Amino acid sequence: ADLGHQTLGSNDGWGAYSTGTTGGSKASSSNVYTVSNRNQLVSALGKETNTTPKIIYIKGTIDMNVDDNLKPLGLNDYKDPEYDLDKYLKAYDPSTWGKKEPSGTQEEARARSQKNQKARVMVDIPANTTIVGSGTNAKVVGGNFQIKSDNVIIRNIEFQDAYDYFPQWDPTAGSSGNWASQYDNITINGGTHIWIDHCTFNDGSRPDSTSPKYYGRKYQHHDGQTDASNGANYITMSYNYYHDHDASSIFGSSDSKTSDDGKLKITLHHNRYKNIVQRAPRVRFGQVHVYNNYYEGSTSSSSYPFSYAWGIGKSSKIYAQNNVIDVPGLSAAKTISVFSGGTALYDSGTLLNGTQINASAANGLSSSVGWTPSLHGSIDASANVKSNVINQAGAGKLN
Ligand SMILES: O=C(O)[C@H]1O[C@H](O[C@@H]2[C@H](O)[C@@H](O)[C@@H](O[C@@H]3[C@H](O)[C@@H](O)[C@@H](O[C@@H]4[C@H](O)[C@@H](O)[C@@H](O[C@@H]5[C@H](O)[C@@H](O)[C@@H](O[C@@H]6[C@H](O)[C@@H](O)[C@@H](O)O[C@@H]6C(=O)O)O[C@@H]5C(=O)O)O[C@@H]4C(=O)O)O[C@@H]3C(=O)O)O[C@@H]2C(=O)O)[C@H](O)[C@@H](O)[C@H]1O
Ligand SMILES: [Co+2]
Structure with a gap:
């Protein structure tokens, strides 16, 4: 079968549990679409009530920051008439505003401005849907797919630069405040039975190094890549870059x-x-099987320096098997970050810079997380993970 019609294999991760993940594989002829712009994409998705099995092929680049005639939209098109960057910055400067949450005229105008962009860039994917890129160059630019439904497959798409023109200042986020934006590439918000496979996720032409700092903090236009919230459950993400x-x-x-x-x-x-x-990933609560992934970076990079791979958050149940981490000079302990309420990590076969390590033990964590994954495909020896993952992960590797 082609990518539009394949289903998640019956053993391929938590997505295969119970009713499994078949997306729109059984689509009848009038529920197969090929789409090459936001209008066509939006028409094909339709509303939450469009639950018949459907297959959507993305052809080329779909820019989501466009109006109903596909004219590009930027900051000045979305701005609320009362919003102004310089006045926003003046209103909320910690120097005069202190550390209370921004409120009042500029923050309200900023919030409305952000809703203006959300209406264009964020789209919900209805139940029983497979969306896949055609060829090696299918792209979704500026979009945030949101999945609240059941039974959805997304493959072979390069997601770029889910960019928020109106980051919000929060002086109480972290030790020194942080700017925060709203759009992920994919947000799974209570979605269930989902397969994300052979996609690429990056910041496109607007990496964080092109943003200035305000109040000493990066003016962050991005948020997550693939986040999962609000009882999201039964999901496999494989071969993504x-x-x-x-x-x-x-x-x-x-x-x-x-x-x-x-x-x-x-x-x-x-x-x-x-x-x-x-946050790769940062987990609370869930039984998350993490295996045969490859992580590579540098702690001294000016652009996107490595901080940590796995976040051991409250009551998380990460089961890590044969992962390979390549970050020069990093200690075994610092491969992970442990947050309050995180106390357990199953950790087997981890290689750090070519040496076998145990991050769990190095962080004093319990070595068992109270479960063993039964749904998985073949387990690569760690020695082969780097090569297999570089060769195979991401969009345009199949087609
Ligand atoms: O269908 C819809 O469209 C839907 O839309 C609305 O609802 C959505 C959402 O579905 C709701 O659940 C809710 O989401 C809430 C919030 O608005 C949303 O942004 C979100 O984010 C999480 C946290 O609330 C954020 O503060 C943030 O947190 C992370 C870490 O988790 C946090 O620990 C902290 O991290 C610390 C330090 O602060 C950091 O500096 C760093 O160093 O790390 C440590 C650490 O990791 O511990 O801050 C970070 C961070 O800044 O990112 O991010 C979280 C996240 O998952 O992104 O979740 C909120 C919630 O669950 O309540 O509201 C959403 C919304 O759009 O308003 C509509 O309201 C609804 O009607 C519906 O229609
Ligand atoms: Co997010």
Whole structure:
């Protein structure tokens, strides 16, 4: 079968659990579409009620920052009449505003401005849908796919530069405040039975090094690459190439969201993370199988310096098997970051710079996470992960 019609293999990660992930493979003839611009994409997706099996082939580059006639839209097209960058910055300067949350005229105008862009760039993917790139050059630029539904497959697409023209200042985020944006490439918000495979995720032409710092902090126009929230469950992400981007994948968005416990069952395998700073993934609560992924970066890079690969968050149940990390000078301990409530990590076969290590033990964590994945394909020896993943991961590697 072609990529439009294949389904997730019955053993291929948590996505294969229960009813599995077949997307739109059974689409009838009038529910197969080929799309090459936002209008055609939006028409094919339709609304939440469009749950019949459907297959959507993306042909070429689809820019999501465009109007209904496909004219490109930028900052001045989205700006609320009352929003102004220089006045926003003057209003919320910690020097005069202090550390309270921004509120009042400019913040309200900024919020409305951001909703103006969201209406163009964010689209929901309805149940029983397969979306795949045709050829080696299918691209989604500036878009944020959101998946709240069940049974969805996304493959062979290069997602670039989910860019927010209106980052919000938050003085209380982190030790010194941070600017925050809204758009991921893909957000799984309660979505279930999802396969993301052979896609590429990067920051396109606007990497973070082209953004200035305001109040000493990077004016961050990006957010995540593939994030999962709000009881998202039964998901396989395989053979994806994440590169040149700060925060990759947060699974479980909040310590208070205890309803995520027993959910966020996600398998990550054969993904490549190059020049990714952090959160690859950062997990709360979930049983997440992480195996045969390759991570490569430098702690001294000026653009996207490595901070950590796996985030051991509250009650996370990461099961790591035969992953390979190549970051010169990094210690075994610093391959991961442990956050409050994170106490356990199964860690087997990890190579760091060519040497076998145990990040879990080095961080004092419990060596068992109370589960063993049954749904997986073949396990590569760690010695072969780098080569297999560089050769095979990302869009345009099949076609
Ligand atoms: O269908 C819709 O479209 C839908 O849209 C709305 O709802 C969405 C969403 O579905 C809701 O659940 C909710 O989302 C809430 C929030 O608005 C959203 O941005 C989000 O984000 C998470 C956290 O809330 C963020 O603060 C943030 O946090 C991360 C870390 O998790 C956090 O620990 C911290 O990290 C620290 C330091 O601060 C950092 O500096 C760094 O060093 O690391 C450490 C660390 O890792 O611990 O801050 C970071 C960060 O800044 O990114 O990001 C989280 C994330 O997953 O991105 O989740 C919120 C929530 O779960 O409540 O609201 C959304 C919204 O759009 O408003 C509509 O409201 C709804 O009607 C619906 O229609
Ligand atoms: Co996100």
